[PDB]
Amino acid sequence: TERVKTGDRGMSHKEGGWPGNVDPNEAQETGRFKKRIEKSFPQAVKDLK
Amino acid sequence: AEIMKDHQIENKKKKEVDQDKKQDQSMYSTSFKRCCKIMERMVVQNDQEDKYHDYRYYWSKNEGHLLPIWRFSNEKQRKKNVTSICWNPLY
Amino acid sequence: NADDQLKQLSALEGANGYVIFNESGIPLKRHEKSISHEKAVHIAALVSDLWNVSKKVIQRDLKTPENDIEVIRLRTKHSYEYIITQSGDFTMLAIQLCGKAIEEAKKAAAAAAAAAVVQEENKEKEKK
Amino acid sequence: IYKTSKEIQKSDQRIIQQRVENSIINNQIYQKSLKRKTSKRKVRHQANKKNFQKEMSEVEDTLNRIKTHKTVLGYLIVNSEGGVVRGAFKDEEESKNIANSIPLLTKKARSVVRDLDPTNDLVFLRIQTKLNEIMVAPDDEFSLIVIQTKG
Amino acid sequence: MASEVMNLSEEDIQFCQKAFSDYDEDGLGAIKVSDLKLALENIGCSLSENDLFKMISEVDEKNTGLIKFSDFLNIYYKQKYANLGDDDQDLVDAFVAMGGNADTTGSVDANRLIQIVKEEFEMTIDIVGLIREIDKDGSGEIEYEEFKLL
Amino acid sequence: KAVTDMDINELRKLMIGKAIINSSDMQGDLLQEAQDVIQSGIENNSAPVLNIEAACKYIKENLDKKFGPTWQCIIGEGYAYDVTVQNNTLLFMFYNGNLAVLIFKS
Amino acid sequence: SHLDKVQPVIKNSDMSVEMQKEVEEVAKKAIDYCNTDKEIATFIKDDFRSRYHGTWHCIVGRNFGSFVTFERSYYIYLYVGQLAILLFKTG
């Protein structure tokens, strides 16, 4: 009888949720993305604070 | 818990004798009393929030302004006069 | 302009740190005293689960139509306080302490300064 | 003499129950509870007895006072095991929903506080909705929840 | 198309109750999640493993269709029987009530008397029977017994 | 001193070799072999900064050779999971600090 | 508008695109339906088991490391917020 294939893959979910295009490990990808969000962002933070 | 087992010094007290009695007034006494006391102040704080905010910092040339904030009295104790008043040194 | 708000939050008495969360859950800005990014990643996940569960629970579990939570404040042991306010798509966590806690923090800072002074004196003695 | 004997027995029973109470004023809720448990041979009478089912005004008295306070919908105590020890709301559906839904949020909320610092434990939690304010005080033995409309 | 089949109604009705409960949607179909919804609402079983066990044993399963209803139809049949024991007083009463009931007397007193080293060997026993006999009928029924013992 | 002196940061720093078992469903003799291998493997592959993927790869390879061809173990800071496993094939033990380890045989 | 806001993203996907699209809707529906994260794991496993026969293991946590032996083309990895919906069917 055919044996269903078993593939062993190991991954780490320690890094926080991020967009697929951006890379969590790379500092440059995260830094550029944060700057884009605050471009809006300014009003909310004073108001939230 | 394992660390406590390793070091058997000053074993935790507060043995669970509790209050029991099944019905007509189980528990409702010392840790729970603190929560109820905190809850009463929080409910009072929300209603008196406008007054409390003014009391903390309303910030009131030779002129003086006095504003009464709250009055504490008892209808039963209305006959009694205020007489002597004192403030605890510690608090 | 945006940077000044973070400085203003620190200026308020009883404030330890401020964390801002995006709808995705990325932490926009966090305080320097508190851990940056690692703590923010851990704080953003917990607040989103709590804020989403509380927002969902109020509408259905309490059976109240058009009722939305505005501010959540969790008072724990010692001086910890964690007011949560959501503006637009961004929700932030603010950690403030009580008067006693603030006094303790000030004392600790003074002790650290004294230790630094002692170290400087020791260095001067070594130089001499 | 049989009646006399019975009377004597009753008296004896009464004495045993007292001991700590030492007669005098009706006093104490705790004392009454203890007597009921240990010895159930005799009950009631003895003295004035103050107010029935009122062993201690202070926790019970404080809860009555907060409920009487203006702008408070009610205060419902939640048992550690998802139960209503005491319910004080105008509509049963709101109280029933509050009894099950509110403790689950507090337990989830307690863990959120718990994740940041393990030593730190929830002392008090307050959630403010657009039309109402919800305050929950959590203890291992019992949880106190009060809903007060914002002024 | 029935064919002269009485069968139980208590259970047959229960299934319909829980069924329409979650199926109230009126979708006309049933999924593998809905079947667990009921047990998840009332808390019949501890884990889906239970319901899944019996159901799976039935034959097979899939994603969603309508036959899933079988879960309930069979669920009622997996309830089986209960039995537990409560109190130790009732037993004591029955030890004396040989006619397998509270009723009759003195014969049980004599049974106690066989090899009895107790004080007031027989006068005490008669006094005890009288004390346990509140309505004066010469016997102690279960209610009198309980009041006597408590 | 004692428990009062101890703090959560202090407790983690004071002991890094403490082993705590939360859930046991596997035979005790089997658990002893597995516990020694997982503790030794994680420390060896911990490196400068602990890698979740690195620890799992070493554990997965060791377990497959040690007992059965299909063995799955997942370690994370915090997680919620439903897993169907064979009788006496699942062992759950979490290391001191924020480290949860789940190992089961399928 | 909450569904638009979550924007669940699959970091690693090993399944047919049509099947993968179905998983995203189930993942969004499961998060709103389940009060707690533990409930979300049970709901995802039950829905997939009903949809596709087999043994499904699902683990969702804020931070975790996973190495698994799953049937080829039956493992889909998607991350929404701080929750990882991971399902791997093992024969």
- What is the DSSP annotation of B22-70? SSSS-S-SSHHHHHHHHHHHHHHHHHTHHHHHHHHH-------------
Among residues C82, C48, C52, C81, the alpha carbon closest in space to that of C69 is found at C52
- Please answer yes or no on whether F8 and D115 come within 8 Å at the CB atom: no
CA angle A28, A34, A40 (to 5 degrees): 155
Q: Output the six-digit token pair for D119.
A: 């030593």
Q: C20 with C29: CB under 8 angstroms?
A: yes
The secondary element (H helix, E strand) that includes residue E57 is helix E48-58
- Please answer yes or no on whether D126 and C54 come within 8 Å at the CB atom: no
- What is the DSSP annotation of B73-90? --SGGGSS--------S-
Q: Which residues contact residue D118 at a Cβ distance below 8 angstroms, ignoring those fewer than 6 apart?
A: F8
Among residues G40, G36, G4, A17, the alpha carbon closest in space to that of C54 is found at G36
How distant, in Å, are the alpha carbons of D76, D84, D132 from that of C64?
Answer: 18, 20, 11
Whole-number CA gyration radius for chain F: 15
The secondary element (H helix, E strand) that includes residue D84 is strand D83-86
C-alpha–C-alpha distance, residues C52 and E141, integer Å: 62
B16 phi and psi angles, rounded to 5 deg: -80, 55
**F71 DSSP β-pair partners:** F105
Resolution in A: 4.5
- What is the DSSP annotation of C59-98? HHTT--TT--EEEEEEEESTT-BEEEEEETTEEEEEEE--
Q: C91 with D150: CB under 8 angstroms?
A: no
Write the burial class of residue D122 (CB in 10 Å: 0-12 exposed, 13-18 middle, 19+ buried).
buried
Q: Which residues of G touch D108 (CB under 8 A)?
A: 35-36
CA F43 to chain centre: 11
Tokens 């002196």 identify what position?
A: F5
- What HEC string does chain F produce? CHHHHCCHHHHHHHCCCCEEEEEECCCHHHHHHHHHHHHHHHHHHHCCCCCHHHHHHHHHHHHHHHCCCCEEEEEEEEEEEECCCCCCCEEEEEECCCEEEEEEEC
C-alpha–C-alpha distance, residues C56 and C50, integer Å: 10
C-alpha–C-alpha distance, residues D122 and C78, integer Å: 10
Among residues A40, E59, B88, the alpha carbon closest in space to that of C22 is found at A40
CA G47 to chain centre: 10
Q: Which residues contact residue D108 at a Cβ distance below 8 angstroms, ignoring those fewer than 6 apart?
A: C49, C50, C53, G35, G36
Q: In Å, how far is G88's CA from the nearest CA of chain E?
A: 17
C-alpha–C-alpha distance, residues B60 and B47, integer Å: 22
How distant, in Å, are the alpha carbons of D53, D62, E26 from that of D57?
Answer: 10, 8, 54
C-alpha–C-alpha distance, residues F67 and F51, integer Å: 24
Q: Output the six-digit token pair for G89.
A: 């069917």
D129 phi and psi angles, rounded to 5 deg: -85, 170
- Residue E81, number of CB atoms within 10 A of its CB: 4
Among residues C102, E69, D31, G68, the alpha carbon closest in space to that of F59 is found at G68
Q: Which residues contact residue D138 at a Cβ distance below 8 angstroms, ignoring those fewer than 6 apart?
A: B35, D106, D110, D122, D124, D125
CA atoms within 13 A on the CB side of C81: 16
SS3 G78: strand
- Residue D151, number of CB atoms within 10 A of its CB: 11
C-alpha–C-alpha distance, residues B25 and D28, integer Å: 13
- Count H helices, E strands: chain D? 4, 5
Among residues B24, B13, B38, the alpha carbon closest in space to that of D138 is found at B38
- Please answer yes or no on whether B46 and D139 come within 8 Å at the CB atom: no
Specify the length of chain D in residues. Answer: 151
C-alpha–C-alpha distance, residues A27 and A12, integer Å: 18
C-alpha–C-alpha distance, residues B3 and F22, integer Å: 15
Q: In Å, how far is D80's CA from the nearest CA of chain F?
A: 23
C-alpha–C-alpha distance, residues C32 and C34, integer Å: 5
> What is the dihedral angle through the alpha carbons of G23, G27, G30, G32, rounded to the nearest 10 degrees?
-140
Expt. technique: cryo-EM
How distant, in Å, are the alpha carbons of E109, E112, E115, E138 from that of E118?
Answer: 12, 9, 9, 22
CA atoms within 13 A on the CB side of B1: 3
Chains with 3 or more CB pairs under 8 A to chain D: B, C, F, G
C-alpha–C-alpha distance, residues D137 and B37, integer Å: 10
- Please answer yes or no on whether D116 and C43 come within 8 Å at the CB atom: yes
Q: G61 with F79: CB under 8 angstroms?
A: yes
Q: Which residues contact residue E37 at a Cβ distance below 8 angstroms, ignoring those fewer than 6 apart?
A: E22
Q: F63 with F71: CB under 8 angstroms?
A: yes
What sign does the dihedral G21-G22-G23-G28 (CA atoms) show? positive
Specify the length of chain B in residues. Answer: 91
CA B26 to chain centre: 23
Percentages (nearest 5) of helix, strand, coil residues in chain E:
55, 0, 45
Specify the length of chain C in residues. Answer: 128
C-alpha–C-alpha distance, residues D11 and D16, integer Å: 9
Chain C: which residues have CB within 8 Å of chain G? 23-25, 41-42, 44-46, 48-49, 52-53, 56-57, 61, 89
First to last CA, chain G: 39
Q: Output the six-digit token pair for E114.
A: 């066989």
CA angle E102, E106, E107 (to 5 degrees): 85
C-alpha–C-alpha distance, residues G6 and B40, integer Å: 39
- Please answer yes or no on whether B21 and D148 come within 8 Å at the CB atom: no
C-alpha–C-alpha distance, residues D97 and D76, integer Å: 11
Q: G81 with C24: CB under 8 angstroms?
A: yes
C-alpha–C-alpha distance, residues D123 and D121, integer Å: 6
| Residue in D100, D123, D131 nearest the CB of C76 | D123
Q: Output the six-digit token pair for F44.
A: 């060896």
SS3 D128: strand
Q: Output the six-digit token pair for F82.
A: 């439903």
- Residue D132, number of CB atoms within 10 A of its CB: 17
C-alpha–C-alpha distance, residues C115 and G19, integer Å: 63
C-alpha–C-alpha distance, residues G50 and G40, integer Å: 16
Among residues C127, C93, C126, C113, the alpha carbon closest in space to that of C16 is found at C93
**F74 DSSP β-pair partners:** F102, G66
Residue type, position F42, single letter: I
How distant, in Å, are the alpha carbons of B42, C117, D51, E79 from that of E82?
Answer: 50, 78, 45, 9
Q: Output the six-digit token pair for G45.
A: 């496993």
